[PDB]
Amino acid sequence: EMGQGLHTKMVQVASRALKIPTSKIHISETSTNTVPNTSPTAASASADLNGQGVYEACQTILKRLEPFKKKKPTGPWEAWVMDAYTSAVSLSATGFYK
Amino acid sequence: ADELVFFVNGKKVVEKNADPETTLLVYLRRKLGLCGTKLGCGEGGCGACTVMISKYDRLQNKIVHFSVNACLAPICSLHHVAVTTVEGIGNTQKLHPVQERIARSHGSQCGFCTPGIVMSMYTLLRNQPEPTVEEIENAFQGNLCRCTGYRPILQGFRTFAKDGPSLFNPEDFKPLDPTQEPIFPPELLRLKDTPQKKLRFEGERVTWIQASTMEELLDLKAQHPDAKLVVGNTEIGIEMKFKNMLFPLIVCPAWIPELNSVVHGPEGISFGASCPLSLVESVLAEEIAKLPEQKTEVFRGVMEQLRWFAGKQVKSVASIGGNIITASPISDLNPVFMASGAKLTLVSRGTRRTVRMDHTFFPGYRKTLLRPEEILLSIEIPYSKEGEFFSAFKQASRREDDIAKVTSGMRVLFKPGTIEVQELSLCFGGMADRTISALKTTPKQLSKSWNEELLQSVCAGLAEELQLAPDAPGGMVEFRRTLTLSFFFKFYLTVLQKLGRADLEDMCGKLDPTFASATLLFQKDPPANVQLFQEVPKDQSEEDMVGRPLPHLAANMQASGEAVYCDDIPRYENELSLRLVTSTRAHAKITSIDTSEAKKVPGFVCFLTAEDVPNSNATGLFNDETVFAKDEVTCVGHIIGAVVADTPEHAQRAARGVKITYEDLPAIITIQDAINNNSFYGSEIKIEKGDLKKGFSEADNVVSGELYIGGQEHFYLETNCTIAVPKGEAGEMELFVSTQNTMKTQSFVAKMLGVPDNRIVVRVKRMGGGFGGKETRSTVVSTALALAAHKTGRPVRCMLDRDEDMLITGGRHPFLAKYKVGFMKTGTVVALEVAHFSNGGNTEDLSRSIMERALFHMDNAYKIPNIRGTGRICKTNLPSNTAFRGFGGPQGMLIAEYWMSEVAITCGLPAEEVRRKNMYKEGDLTHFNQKLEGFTLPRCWDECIASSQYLARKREVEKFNRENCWKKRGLCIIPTKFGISFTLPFLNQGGALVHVYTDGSVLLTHGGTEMGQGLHTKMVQVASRALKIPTSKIHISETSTNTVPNTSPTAASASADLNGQGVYEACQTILKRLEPFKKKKPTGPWEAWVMDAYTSAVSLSATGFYKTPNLGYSFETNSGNPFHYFSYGVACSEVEIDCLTGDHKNLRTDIVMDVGSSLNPAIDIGQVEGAFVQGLGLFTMEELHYSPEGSLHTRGPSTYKIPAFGSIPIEFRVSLLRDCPNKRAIYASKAVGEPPLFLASSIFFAIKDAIRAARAQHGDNAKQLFQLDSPATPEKIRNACVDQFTTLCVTGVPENCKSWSVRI
Amino acid sequence: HFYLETNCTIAVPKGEAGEMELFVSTQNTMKTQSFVAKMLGVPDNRIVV
Amino acid sequence: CDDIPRYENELSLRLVTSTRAHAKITSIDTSEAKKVPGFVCFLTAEDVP
């Protein structure tokens, strides 16, 4: 983030992908020990590239939560997540795009 | 003058405003930033702060070197010396041989004690380049290690000794070149030729005068009698730090030549009062070597006491005068000085007098007959005369660096050519508020002949004269009384022997040869150790390190003091310090809080309480705890609030100015208190199988009884510590924490603040030990600190002092068991009922899970067809007890082995036969209906029984016992079964994240935390195999909630299993991605595949995850598997007890352990040894004492005696079972951390066997199936060896009187 | 460019294994890491930007 | 970046740059720099590991 509102856009993207409010998603920083081998934030293309990456990481999480969603299609986001956690399902994912 | 000038690692320090209250440890760490030197205790008992001092000694005219405790050395005592720290001898770029050998020999696990031990060994080598094995062990009397079990440290350092597949190769150790040590600062040599002048230092509260001449000292003492002398500071430093005493004017006389002199006179040797005992020791040693035995009786008495007096660090600076004038009731020297009538010269301006230490020298508690203006100049220790014999005695909890329970000096003078008593002196410490003489007993024996009548007279006399009040400070009233008589008996026999060697055998009679062993002075044979493990296949790549003894990845850094623990992190310029304020009442309403005095302390910022909590004051694993006390306090140590100040000194002072008013509420302390008040965490837990009525009715015999098992303090050498750094945006905070549980730290901070978890990052690089103590209880510091940071917008730090940590953070659960066992005459057990009670303290925490694991292990290794166990967790007004390595298993299994011991005795059959024939077999179901597959225990048993030559050794033990009346041996072999997996199924999960950078280097992280168990090392070994690249290309830097989320605690021995699988999966994903590049260039190197993947836009980042499958037990239905697999092992231990003192030697232990296919045999053997020695402490040494009002008395290494270097089995053999792959864990390994700990029960039951022999010897009537609670301390051992001495000392507990301590 | 914030680096040495953490005003964490690591002669895995 | 609090042991760096478009460096004299209070070191190419 250099004032172009990239984190703002990625949160907006993630919120649509996950179908939860933006209030429940946070970005703190960019770091080589969380995402390696990154291209510079340049060529106007950072929302294009990182938005797809974010989208894919979100889709993985969704896919992992869908058994818990089916079992409780009304019960809130928080219940799906806790259910996944106590069934020992991973709540961490990478995403990538080229 | 008033500039303080000294050197640190060769660099001159000029301190223009030295404060007398500043310790060297604080100066090194906080002023100079040299954090290799550690705080472990602040009271001189652990040696984590050891450094070397060099100076030009003007009196001896040469450069000298000695070791000190930096925690107790005032910088104002250090003018014109040269300090060397661990940083001063070497670094990872060029390690000193001492650093290299401790690292490479697997002598550094958690690493927190490593610098201190390094500096003890370093100092020894600077003084003696070719030490003996004995001198090496002696170097570490004042160093503690909680992880290693000590064996590898000594084994590595044995390579320096003049008198000297494998885990390490000493042949590869680089040689010592002493010309390459640091120069003695030339400036100090120059300055040696200037007169010393008097220096004056002025601090916030204290003035320090370093006096250069006797005149200045006596003048100052005349004009200001209040001036407090300080020499070594090893008492004053304690009084100041622990008893809140302030002496605003101090005078240090250490430089004054008259106080440092040694004069050989006709009557004896006179020591200046400021002579260190190190100098007394070397002077008396040489005197004893060269003079006739007849003249050195008293010298040898002093030396005997100095053997067991602290360690090298304390004795280097502690003065003979300081010990005398301190006038502790438990002085080890004053009894000897008094018994020998040692001559003290006292002076003041214009007065000189000489006195003989007798009863009148010590009038009252900590007083002498010195006038306030008088100092002690010298003490003459006397030559012994013909017919004059001397003995000194000390019995403590542990032999090395411990405080006397009873200590004594005893002297007799015979009328010449006779066996008639001319003089008799019997003096004791630990029997009164002062050093006392047995003045009513002793004169009656004058003119008597040294014979059985005198023995019986003196014992009757001592028992009447040396009364103790039930409430006597220290408790252990019966034991202490027994010791006075027991010591006299040894003296009696010793004098018989000494008479004998004076050709008067005919007159006094010879010693019955079965009594001779009673009079031997402690000697321990040199150690002999064996480590057996399995070689990896000949085919295995040299780059595949799985199953190889790779040293801990941080070992070199730990040896060099470069490894960073939480408090070693540099402070931000705006960083504040936090001090917790805790309840001094077990149960009370908080009436009011007065912060008026606290606000006056310079740098005070604020006092945080429940009202300052932004969101929720409800915390802890079951949400039943406060962040800060609200309305009532429910234990002594309950956190009420927290002071925030600029510095720790100012936070501590301000905290003392927080005055709290209480109104007491009914307190529930003990397990019994809880049973009577029906106060429990939840309902009864129960496992039951078969038919209990039938079994008992079928049984030939039934035995009932109880067992009490004392709790345990973790004594991680690094206490609890958190730094919280507020980021100023969106509630973001980063915490650096010594914790095994990042997830709960994160959750608890977030909930307290009312922010989402995604705002809070918790980072753990490494812990200086955890052992379960940091699975949950770390959060009580983390939340406090987080709040301070939030409130102030500034980083805030808190590291607990040892006393704080030990009081607040709780321990292993004490257990009370009531059992009833039914068995046949053959020793086969057919029925068992056990009720378990644990003392959980004032929050639930992990108590219920700990009870479940105890119940899951009440079988130990034994098939019992009809069985019923219950557990109940008591809710009390004590600190909340928590996880400790074993987590209820050790307690469960000790009870099992205890009734098992009584089955064997009742049947009159050999215990090993009875254990073996009750042992499970392959395919059996446990009492909880889990099938035992891959049941290796019988193999472990047969190998151990054979390699330890158990049967031949039985014969030697029996023979020893028939030939010795006052020493006995015992021998026992104990098995164990330990279920692997968290009792809560869903905690059996872990995650990893891996990156490959475009240079080919790999950055790995996983949910596990490093606490010295070598978890990161193992995960690197795993990743290296999985990726097929050298370990050198893979790095783990830290554990963090923002790299791997929702991690279970590093606990349940499980972390290598879970994180190993996660790492493996993450690695498999990367390999799947590189496959197409591998295929195109199959020999082209790893770096080329990676760069190719990168330039092909292929992700080089992956998560990995694992969950342990098929787990979930139901108590309702006694079905489902709680465990993934079981660990198995056997230990055979031999002991020799002192029937007169309760001391014992651990002669030999042999362990066979099933660790599957070890991931790392060096680490796994280290875990076996470490775990075993923690169990050794639990069952035989470690004891917590509480006031009747629930206040912990035991708050430091002075009173809490963990195993020392000298505690471990002399002969210590560990074998990892060969050829036992465990399919269902990572690379066929098994978890190792907790299962070995219970095998130290072998020492407990070996002691129990020896005691049984002692009771057969001297008992008469003696109850068979006598009681031995845990821990089996010297007190319990001695009290159980009933004899003519105990019989004359027993009786009391007059009804419900007040006593020092209550069993909780 | 006249970015209102000029170029700025904080580098924090960790004293273990060549590890170093850098706080940087940069659009390019990867090349920052790479260039620091090559200059020091340590692997990328020791350097966090 | 510069709003991050300094560590109590934190140092400051200042680059020394060429005042010529194209030249040989004939010599460097740090003798006046060494006189400045708080001066620690002057890094050059020879310091690169």
Ligand SMILES: Cc1cc2nc3c(=O)[nH]c(=O)nc-3n(C[C@H](O)[C@H](O)[C@H](O)COP(=O)(O)OP(=O)(O)OC[C@H]3O[C@@H](n4cnc5c(N)ncnc54)[C@H](O)[C@@H]3O)c2cc1C
């Ligand atoms: C880890 C540890 C272990 C210990 N173990 C033991 C043990 O096993 N047995 C035992 O007996 N003690 C033990 N001690 C106590 C202590 O080490 C000794 O009492 C030591 O001899 C004190 O000497 P010092 O020079 O450090 O005294 P300081 O603390 O400097 O002074 C102690 C007292 O003596 C006074 N004083 C000192 N010199 C003179 C003088 N010439 N004239 C008048 N007053 C004087 C001081 O004013 C002060 O009141 C231990 C202490 C520690 C920290």
Ligand SMILES: O=c1[nH]c(=O)c2[nH]c(=O)[nH]c2[nH]1
């Ligand atoms: O089954 C266990 N659960 C835990 O939470 C834990 N913690 C520990 O030290 N050992 C164990 N064992």
Ligand code: FES
């Ligand atoms: S910290 Fe100094 S001896 Fe423990």
Ligand code: FES
């Ligand atoms: S390695 Fe010694 S205390 Fe940890």
